[PDB]
Amino acid sequence: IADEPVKASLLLHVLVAHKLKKSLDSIPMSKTIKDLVGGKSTVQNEILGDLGKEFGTTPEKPEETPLEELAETFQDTFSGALGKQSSSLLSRLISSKMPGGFTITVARKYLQTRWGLPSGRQDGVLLVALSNEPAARLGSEADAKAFLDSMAQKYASIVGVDL
Amino acid sequence: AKGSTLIVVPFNQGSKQDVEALIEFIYDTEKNGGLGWDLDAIIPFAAIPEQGIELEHIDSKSEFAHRIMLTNILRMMGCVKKQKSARGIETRPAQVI
Amino acid sequence: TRGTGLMSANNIIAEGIEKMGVRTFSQKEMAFNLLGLLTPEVVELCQKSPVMADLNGGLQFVPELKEFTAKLRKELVETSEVRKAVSIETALEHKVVNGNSADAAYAQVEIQPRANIQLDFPELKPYKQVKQIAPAELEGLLDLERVIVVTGFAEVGPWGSARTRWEMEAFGEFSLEGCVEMAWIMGFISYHNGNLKGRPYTGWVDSKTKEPVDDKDVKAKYETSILEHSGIRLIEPELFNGYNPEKKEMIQEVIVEEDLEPFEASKETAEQFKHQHGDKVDIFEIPETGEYSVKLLKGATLYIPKALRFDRLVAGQIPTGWNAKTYGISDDIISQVDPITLFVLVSVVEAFIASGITDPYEMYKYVHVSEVGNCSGSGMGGVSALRGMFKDRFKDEPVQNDILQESFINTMSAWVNMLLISSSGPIKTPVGACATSVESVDIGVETILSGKARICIVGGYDDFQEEGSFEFGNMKATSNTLEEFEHGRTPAEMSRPATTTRNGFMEAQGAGIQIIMQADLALKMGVPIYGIVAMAATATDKIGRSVPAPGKGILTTAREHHSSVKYASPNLNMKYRKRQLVTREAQIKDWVENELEALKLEAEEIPSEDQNEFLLERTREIHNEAESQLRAAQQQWGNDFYKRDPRIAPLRGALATYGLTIDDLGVASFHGTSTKANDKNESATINEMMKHLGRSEGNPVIGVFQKFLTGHPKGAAGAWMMNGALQILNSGIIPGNRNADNVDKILEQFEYVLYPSKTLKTDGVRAVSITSFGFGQKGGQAIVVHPDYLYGAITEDRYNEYVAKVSAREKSAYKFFHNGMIYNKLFVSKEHAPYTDELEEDVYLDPLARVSKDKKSGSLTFNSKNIQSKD
Amino acid sequence: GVATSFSRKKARTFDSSWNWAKQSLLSLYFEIIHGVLKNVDREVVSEAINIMNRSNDALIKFMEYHISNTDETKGENYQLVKTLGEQLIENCKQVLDVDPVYKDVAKPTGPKTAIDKNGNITYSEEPREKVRKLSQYVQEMALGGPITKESEDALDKDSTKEVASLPNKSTISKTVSST
Amino acid sequence: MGEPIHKIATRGVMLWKEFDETIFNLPKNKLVPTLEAKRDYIISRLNADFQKPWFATVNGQARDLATMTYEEVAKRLVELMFIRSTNSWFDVTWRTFTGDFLRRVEERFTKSKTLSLIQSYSLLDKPDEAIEKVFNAYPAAREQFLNAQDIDHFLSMCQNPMQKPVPFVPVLDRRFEIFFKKDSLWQSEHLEAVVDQDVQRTCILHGPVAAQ
Ligand SMILES: NC(=O)c1ccc[n+]([C@@H]2O[C@H](COP(=O)([O-])OP(=O)(O)OC[C@H]3O[C@@H](n4cnc5c(N)ncnc54)[C@H](OP(=O)(O)O)[C@@H]3O)[C@@H](O)[C@H]2O)c1
Ligand SMILES: *OP(=O)(O)OCC(C)(C)[C@@H](O)C(=O)NCCC(=O)NCCSC(=O)CC(C)=O
Secondary structure (H helix, E strand, C coil), rough: CCCCCCCHHHHHHHHHHHHHHHCCCCCCCCHHHHHHHHHCCCHHHHHHHEEEEHHHHCCCCCCCCCHHHHHHHHHCCCCCCCCHHHHHHHHHHHHCCCCCCCHHHHHHHHHHHCCCCHHHHHHHHHHHHCCCCCCCCCCCCHHHHHHHHHHHHHHHHHCCCCC | CCCCCEECCCCCCCCCCHHHHHHHHHHHCCCCCCCCCCCEECCCCCCCCCCCCCCCCCCCHHHHHHHHHHHHHHHHHHHHHHHCCCCCCCCCCEEEE | CCCCCCCHHHHHHHHHHHHCCCHHHHHCHHHHHHCCCCHHHHHHHHHHCCCCCCCCCHHHHHHCCHHHHHHHHHHHHHHHHHHHHHHHHHHHHHHHHHHHCCCCCCCCCEEECCCCCCCCCCCCCCCHHHHHHCCCCCCCEEEEEEHHHEEEEEEECCCCCCHHHHHHHHHCCCCCCHHHHHHHHHEEEEEEEEEECCCEEEEECCCCCCCCCCHHHHHHHHHHHHHHHHCCEEEECCCCCCCCCCCCCEEEEEEEECCCCEEEEEEHHHHHHHHHHHHHHHEECCCCCCCEEEEEEECEEEEEEEEEEECCEEECCCCCCCCCCCCCCCHHHHHHHHHHHHHHHHHHHHHHHHHCCEEEEEEEHCCCCHHHHEEEECCCCHHHHHHHHHHHHHCCCCCCCCCHHCCCCCHHHHHHHHHHCCCCCCEEECCCCCHHHHHHHHHHHHHHHHHHCCCCEEEEEEECCCCHHHHHHHHCCCCHHHHHCCCCHHHCCCCCCCCCCCCCCCCCCEEEEEEEEEEEHHHHHCCCCEEEEEEEEECCCCCCCCCCCCCHHHHHHHHCCCCCCCCCHHHCCHHHHHEEEEHHHHHHHHHHHHHHCCCHHHHHHHCCHHHCCCHHHHHHHHHHHHHHHHHHHHHHHHCCCCCCCCCHHHHHHHHHHHCCCCCCCCCCEECCCCCCCHHHHHHHHEEEEEEEECCCCCCCCECCCCHHHEEEEEHHHHHHHHHHHHHHHHHHHECCCCCCCCHHHHHCCCCCCCCCCCCCECCCCEEEEEEECCCCCCEEEEEECCHHHCHHCCCHHHHHHHHHHHHHHHHHHHHHHHHHHHHCCCCCCCCCCCCCCCCHHHHHCCCCCEEEEECCCCCCCCCHHHHHCCC | CCCCCCCCCCCEEEEEEEHHHHHHHHHHHHHHHCCCCCCHHHHHHHHHHHHHHCHHHHHHHHHHHHHHHHCCCCCCCHHHHHHHHHHHHHHHHHHHCCCCCCCCCCCCCCEEEECCCCCEEEEEECCCCCCCCCHHHHHHHHHCCCCCCCCCCCCHHHHHHHHHHCCCCCCCCCCCCCC | CCCCCCCCCCHHHHHHHHHHCCCCCCCCCHHHHHHHHHHHHHHHHHHHHHCCCCCCCCCCCCHHHCCCCCHHHHHHHHHHHEECCEEECCHHHHHHHHHHHHHHHHHHCCCCCCCCCCHHHHHHHHHHHHHHHHHHHHHHHHHCCCCHHHHHHHHHHHHCCCCCCCCCECCCCHHHHHHHHCCCCHHHHHCCCCCCCHHCCCEEEEECCCCC
16 A cells, blocks of 8 residues: 555653653643643653664753654654654564464564555554563464554544545 | 773673673683683672652563662672682682672 | 852852852862862871861851741742843833834844855965065076876865864864854755745755755754764665675575475576576476476575674765765766775766866866876775676665766766767776875876876775675774774764774775866866875885885885985075076077077978968977976976985985975875874875985874774775865965874874874975885875965966966856756766767867857857867 | 673773773873963873873883974974973883882862752762862861861962973871871 | 836836847846856946945945955945935845844854844944944954855845845846846936936936927
8 A cells, every 4th residue: 555654643642641650631731741640750751762762863942842743853853763762662562462373574474464454554554563562472473463454443543544 | 091901791780691691701711711800899889770660560571670670689799609619719708799 | 169060059049158158169269278188297197087078168167057048049039030020011011002013113134144155166266475575586487387286185084074074073063154054065955936825935855854944044954964974873674785794694504405386486496596506496387377386305505694793884875865966966867886996976067166177078168078087096996897797686675787887987988978078088997995085186297297197187986885894893903883983983984093992993984085287277277276295106115914004115215325415405405496497497498499590491392372371480490499398397397306316215306396395394194094003104104204204303293094984985085185185285274183082192102193082283284295005015105285386486477367266166166066056967967079970080180179169059069160170 | 680791701801901002192292282271271291190000111212303303493382292292201200110109180070950940950070179189189078077077389380390290109198097 | 017108218217128139038038148158248237327336336346245354244235224314224124134144254153053143133323333343253254255055045135025135246147137127117206215326327207298
């Protein structure tokens, strides 16, 4: 289908959501990082460090700037490649949750064959997979493909695509 | 300064195997691919910041930091003692700050 | 202890805690106190019984420390948030009451820098400043037809051009101009001028998304992608015709055991299978279609592809996105030629621009077409075309029919002539492997001194391809990349000359080109002068059975006889030589007087109608022979005083020419491949040269190992080194070897060599040595002297005329450069020669034919009235 | 987190002080001539200490050549590098056979947290007022403070003179322990 | 639009007629070649005769924008658009043009983010002091020709529809008829804004029979 690089607005969302251990819809864009953390500067500084690692540069006041205004500030200098933080988080998701034999490349294959999603939109589905991390490792291959299906539908809903 | 030397080595103080291997390497002969040294001081200042972790929140990162900052300092001093004792070095104690 | 990992979060309250008379330490103070425990007294105390050192500063005596901490942090956050909220409210009250017209006279306008890329022509001092540095006697003493100058230079290599590479080499980061030039080179930005989403835009735009890009926003948006895709890096298969060193395709010959299932193939292809295999194949016509059934039988040879993992994964590749189209080369040229030819054409037009020559035919206003040489060469030439004709042709692939002619080393120089220069000058193509470029300069010099040419393009070029990469690994010349990974090294730090751990060279690709000419012609034309090529020499080594082994031949350039050195020879002393020249200038004058008298006596016997002709001819002949005799004396006492003298080294005399001592050779641009044999042998050669010529103890030459950044490009290596030497001469900045982690202990024995790891901004460099040590015993050296030494040999008026012509040409060059950059037309192929095919013979055979501006087409060409004319 | 990081092959040795001494000197020389370092900077005294700690016969001859060929008539800066150079040559001859010494001469710093009118919190390391040497810091530490109780130099005026004083082991009349 | 007009046969109108017969009556595929071949003649005529002189003219010498410095351009924009007699900018949109240009000069020649020295264009009501002030901060721009990106910007500013057309020809291209013939009528009432204050440049509408 049409290949799109992941938007900074989705990457930023997923990184915050995963760090706070909350769903993407539970995190509203309107609110600032400092509001969301809830007076815990440690977690604030952990998010800032992860965004600084991922996007390279940060704005001057990232604490008081709302998430939609950070996502727009990053998009000006954001390419579309995942980076050093997203890549490591996905590797830790896949290793820790997929059954012994299922690697990242098998997920990328399954998304290219079953759904036909190219590498740019695979990266997006994998980020939606990260945001809704399951509790315990998926026992079999069939419920692991059923999870990747549920994340493709979620990715397609949020971005606005038909599968 | 003159006569100084700086050896930089990758090292995880958290790993027991890195601790044992680093001390073997410092004490091993130059022939066997080590340094052929015998330490006069150890300054084990590794540490990770644990921040906003109360008693109820003590979990993996704390149990790991405690391994770095205590358990593997004791294991390092152990290793240095076992290397000095194997070579009969009874007159050159290594100062641990 | 303030500002550590563990305590940086508490810095804001540290001033508060000190108000309880607690002492908080800086990391320096706390280290000082801890180093006090390692003193012999405390060590002796520790050996008796354990020591407990309180370095608290009274922190233990703070009662309820967390309560005091929590208070101080709350009070500081509160004060912050109050003053921010009150300030915002007071600014909204002042804005409503007085309106939005009050903070429009208070608001100011912000100017963001646009990238203004400069051609960095040499800075010309006033005639009073340049007259001080040269000796007073140098004026009139040199023959300037026999002084070689570099008027222009350029490169195409892993860091882009010579402008970008120099920025990375010297500073280690790009400026705004650097970034924009790399962004343009790598095709990340194009220039747009016209309607863009209705709104009219004139500037840079992203090249894929056509979105506007401000010059300030380039670094933020592209620096990371420009650095990740430049310099020494993992081999990118897209750049090398799908070549992946992880999966390197070979073919195993197997004997077929069981008859393969017939396949359908054309009648021609089936007869070709039958000729090859003989009775081990059965070809049968299919009557239905007329195709043939080809069945391989038991025992037929077959070839099955297998892949090998190769261990050389890293190379100095030209930045990803580089495209000759970006520079203006057309698709018909790109299709036809081998990509090494494209690096050359770009380097040649970019070197003419640095010379301030936008139209090569301009040169034919000042010299005959037979006086513009191409003395430049390669190590292995068009290896893409060789791969075409040895391997791709074998596999019955589609290859062009003229692929042979693209492989020749001498073919790149031909395309420069056939597309840009259209000269009939000399064409001497050296093949020196890693020394090629220095052998090029030496030939280009000897060509210009012999008078066969007055301008040479010189330099070198080489490509990287699969086959070379492999065979350099089989010889173990190149670094094993898997071993470097085992040792922690990233790609950037794999090329590390003069280092303990150096273990083979990084292969690179690219071209470097200099335009050299006589100084007398450069001053006439008003081109910029970057340096004087004082000396250039090649040398073989000796008997031996190792072709790759470097040796000490080039030491011969410092060959000097020290049996009888009690009393200083007059010949080295410039006053003596100037006195003998003035003595001979007086005799040449008396010879012109005596020839004019003898012409007056001979003109009387000629009738009074033919007298005018005869006196014109014979006066011109006298003027010639007077200039010939003056220049021969200038040469004999200014340029060539030391050729016959066994007591003056070629290297000492080159410097002495311009009144420099051996101590005034400040920098040595070492070959410095990062091999064990090369870097020791080179240090040892330079050290022994300098020791023999009596270089003052405590004055080492400052080594410069440019190949830490670029990698070794073979052919091009010395061309790059020269370009760097010229950039050092004109800037005074000596780049350091940022990969020299630890200089090899063996190299301490060489007192006359210093190996810096960081950039020194000196107060000036007077001369630079360049050394190269090719495979096959090609040693080579060139000395290059700061161009301000030349300006002491000319008068104030001639200097000032020069300075005015160069200023004018630097402005036209800036114009041409920026217009070409944005409209992708720096390179403009010539359609036609400067002469029609009817004048071709007439121009070749008249040595005073010059081009002039054709009034209709506005383009320099030969006019039949300026050919075998009287004027 | 217990993943192995250590390998013997990854050890990087740094032992080439003989090269860096000469580079340190040449850097200082040119930084003075260009005016990046001034006669009132503690960076000149720090570089002097670090050069003296790498003194050998090769480094002395290197200084003798560069300093003795410096024209003291090209500028104030060239006169300053000539004067400082001749003093650093004397110091480097005196401490040729002496063991090298840890000797910090950096300005001691205290914490300073400021809130501006707009409410932005900025932490800096501001120089202390009483303590400007380490000798003065050792005195401050010896006296202690109220919470603990039970019941002449040329720094920042003439870097050349402070350099001249470097090799001379000051005799401590009475120790800080008596106070 | 090719509609006939009765104008007094001044030198500028007789040049307008010459160009209507030999340049503007040509098809578009043969217009640009003829403008490149006649260039030198055309510019000599515009400078001597017409009310819109060739912009790129530095003290009598016929240059091109490519071969003018940024000082040269600025001092020509003041010479053509600012009226010494009334000591004011003939149109405000001309002062904006000249300010926009002087800000571009700063953008091109500055090394870092700085404050514009032209804060409000209201400062250009002393144009010689504003110019000196800009070309003293950035004296490199006194000696460099126009960057080709600044030529394209300058010509893009010359075609702005929301300003009084520039009182000069900045280039010979496909748009030379529009440069030459646009806004040709105000000049006869405002000779203080014409080159030599010479009526003979201008276009004055008048009837042949009513002229009696
Ligand atoms: N029948 C007759 O005898 C007769 C005689 C004389 C004139 N006319 C007519 O009068 C009309 C205009 O006269 P013209 O000969 O001068 O033709 P013109 O050159 O096409 O018109 C003048 C143009 O200048 C622009 N302009 C001038 N000052 C401006 C400012 N301060 N701000 C914005 N734009 C400005 C306008 O552009 P924009 O419109 O794009 O803003 C306008 O279209 C024509 O249609 C013509 O036919 C007729
Ligand atoms: O989010 P924040 O408000 O910027 O951080 C608040 C604090 C400081 C409370 C947070 O980082 C935290 O919980 N830190 C841990 C407490 C602490 O600071 N411990 C210090 C460990 S180091 C140490 O104690 C050195 C010493 C004096 O021996």
